[PDB]
Amino acid sequence: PVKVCLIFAGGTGMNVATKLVDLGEAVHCFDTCDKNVVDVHRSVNVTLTKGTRGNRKVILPLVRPQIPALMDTIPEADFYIVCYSLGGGSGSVLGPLITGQLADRKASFVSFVVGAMESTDNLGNDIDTMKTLEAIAVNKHLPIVVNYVPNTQGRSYESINDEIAEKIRKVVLLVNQNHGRLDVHDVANWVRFTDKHNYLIPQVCELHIETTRKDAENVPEAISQLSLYLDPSKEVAFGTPIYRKVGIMKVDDLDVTDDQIHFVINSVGVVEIMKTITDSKLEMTRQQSKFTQRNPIIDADDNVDEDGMVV
Amino acid sequence: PVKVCLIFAGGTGMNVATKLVDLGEAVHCFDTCDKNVVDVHRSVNVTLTKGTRGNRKVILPLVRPQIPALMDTIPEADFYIVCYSLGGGSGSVLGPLITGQLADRKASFVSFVVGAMESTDNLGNDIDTMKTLEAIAVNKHLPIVVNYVPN
Numbered sequence: 001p002v003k004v005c006l007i008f009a010g011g012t013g014m015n016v017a018t019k020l021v022d023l024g025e026a027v028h029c030f031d032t033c034d035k036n037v038v039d040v041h042r043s044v045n046v047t048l049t050k051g052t053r054g055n056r057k058v059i060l061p062l063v064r065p066q067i068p069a070l071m072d073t074i075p076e077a078d079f080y081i082v083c084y085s086l087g088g089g090s091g092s093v094l095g096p097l098i099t100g101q102l103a104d105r106k107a108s109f110v111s112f113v114v115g116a117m118e119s120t121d122n123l124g125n126d127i128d129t130m131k132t133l134e135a136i137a138v139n140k141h142l143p144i145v146v147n148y149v150p151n152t153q154g155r156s157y158e159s160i161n162d163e164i165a166e167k168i169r170k171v172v173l174l175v176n177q178n179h180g181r182l183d184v185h186d187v188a189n190w191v192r193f194t195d196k197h198n199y200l201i202p203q204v205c206e207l208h209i210e211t212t213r214k215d216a217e218n219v220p221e222a223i224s225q226l227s228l229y230l231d232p233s234k235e236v237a238f239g240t241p242i243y244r245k246v247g248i249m250k251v252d253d254l255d256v257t258d259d260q261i262h263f264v265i266n267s268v269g270v271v272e273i274m275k276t277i278t279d280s281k282l283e284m285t286r287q288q289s290k291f292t293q294r295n296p297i298i299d300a301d302d303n304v305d306e307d308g309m310v311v
Numbered sequence: 312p313v314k315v316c317l318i319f320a321g322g323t324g325m326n327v328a329t330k331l332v333d334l335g336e337a338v339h340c341f342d343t344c345d346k347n348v349v350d351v352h353r354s355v356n357v358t359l360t361k362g363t364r365g366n367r368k369v370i371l372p373l374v375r376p377q378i379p380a381l382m383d384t385i386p387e388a389d390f391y392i393v394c395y396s397l398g399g400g401s402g403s404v405l406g407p408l409i410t411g412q413l414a415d416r417k418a419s420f421v422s423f424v425v426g427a428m429e430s431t432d433n434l435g436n437d438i439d440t441m442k443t444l445e446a447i448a449v450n451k452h453l454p455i456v457v458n459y460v461p462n
């Protein structure tokens with residue numbers, strides 16, 4: 001198995017992938033067409049589904065039978081990262097289907113998902129995709145751990161994509177197997193926390209990636225925590241998580257970007273996130289909903305034929 | 312399927328087509344006679360209905376049975392553009408009939424339609440043709456999306 005396999009789906013996933021092409025063979029991209037394929041993608045894996053050239057209900061029956069074929073192109077790995085938009089038609093279908101397959105592999109993985117906010121279609125898709133991940137968490141009895149990134153009004157997709165790529169790199173660093181005290185089994189039991197803590201409920205959880213003790217301590221109701229420290233003198237057993245582990249980073253590890261990084265999983269935060277999306281959409285729809293069309297310009301007097309022709 | 316097929320109907324459609332002849336094979340023109348056919352049209356498709364050499368009620372029964380024949384000359388495309396005057400007799404009949412057929416293809420398309428303003432005949436035709444498009448939108452359960460340009 002490789003150390004980590006990175007999986008990207010849909011346009012948003014393709015776009016984020018462009019920022020991670022230096023990871024090469026470890027990167028696997030999937031989409032239903034080539035609208036988002038650019039030259040830099042030659043450096044990574046790209047697979048497009050057949051017969052599929054925004055509506056998830058339409059895309060699902062077309063792509064479902066192809067999933068096994070997609071999975072054969074994804075090597076066995078010690079950890080996976082999955083990335084896509086919750087709000088489109090392709091990423092939000094391919095992403096969760098592949099995620100279900102990773103759960104069947106008994107894999108350790110996290111996802112980076114975008115809350116798209118443009119339209120009621122985006123918002124509806126966001127809701128259905130979050131519900132999808134919840135259903136998968138239940139059906140596979142496994143936490144589905146996601147770093148949720150909302151497209152906040154006024155912020156460029158470029159900016160958001162940059163932030164996501166930088167977080168993905170921290171996870172790639174986390175799982176690089178080069179830290180003192182930190183095992184592949186330690187990582188597995190961090191993210192698959194219900195395996196050994198059977199009294200906990202598998203569900204959609206959030207991943208919070210923080211670079212200070214203060215920010216990490218402020219994650220509410222933390223369930224499972226992993227901390228990396230460059231200066232082992234700064235290690236402090238803070239917070240109240242059920243599961244906690246620490247790794248010591250190496251100063252000659254060129255990928256070490258920060259002095260300490262905390263990866264905190266909780267789940268009592270997704271609620272609000274969803275509420276904000278529902279409330280925001282409601283307000284927007286209310287302004288556009290409150291409509292009142294005018295009366296028909298044609299009366300029962302006009303002679304209209306079967307094609308609606310009035311001659 | 313081609314990327315886009317452009318369809319023009321009636322005199323106004325023929326006239327607009329002359330400005331788009333560089334698009335060649337993608338352009339398909341239809342009329343009931345040749346009053347608006349000029350040399351540059353050789354570069355595109357032109358089809359004239361049979362037995363039809365301003366009154367829409369008169370033109371409709373003549374052209375309706377020929378529509379299937381017209382549609383066979385229009386390739387399957389990923390998108391269509393339709394263009395005609397709302398206010399004459401030929402464009403405002405051929406245009407919407409072809410539009411109905413495109414709806415049956417489950418096609419994606421938009422139209423460019425002209426609001427003719429010369430006479431009460433033009434204005435009456437404009438009204439009846441807009442109503443036609445509304446009836447089609449309802450019957451085919453599809454938005455009929457038009458860029459409206461008043462003279």
Ligand SMILES: Nc1nc2c(ncn2[C@@H]2O[C@H](COP(=O)(O)OP(=O)(O)O)[C@@H](O)[C@H]2O)c(=O)[nH]1
Binds near residue numbers: 085
């Ligand atoms: N953060 C971010 N959001 C995007 C990007 N592209 C599109 N979006 C938003 O995500 C939604 C889904 O787009 P996309 O991922 O391309 O859809 P898909 O290809 O069907 O999976 C769009 O409607 C936008 O609101 C991107 O590059 N970054």
Ligand SMILES: Nc1nc2c(ncn2[C@@H]2O[C@H](COP(=O)(O)OP(=O)(O)O)[C@@H](O)[C@H]2O)c(=O)[nH]1
Binds near residue numbers: 403
């Ligand atoms: N914008 C524009 N309007 C036109 C043109 N030719 C005619 N019209 C107006 O549109 C009406 C219909 O003309 P036309 O399209 O030739 O009728 P049709 O051949 O029966 O479809 C005329 O009565 C004019 O008011 C044109 O080239 N451009």
Ligand SMILES: [Mg+2]
Binds near residue numbers: 011035090
């Ligand atoms: Mg797409």
Ligand SMILES: [Mg+2]
Binds near residue numbers: 321322346399401
């Ligand atoms: Mg004419």
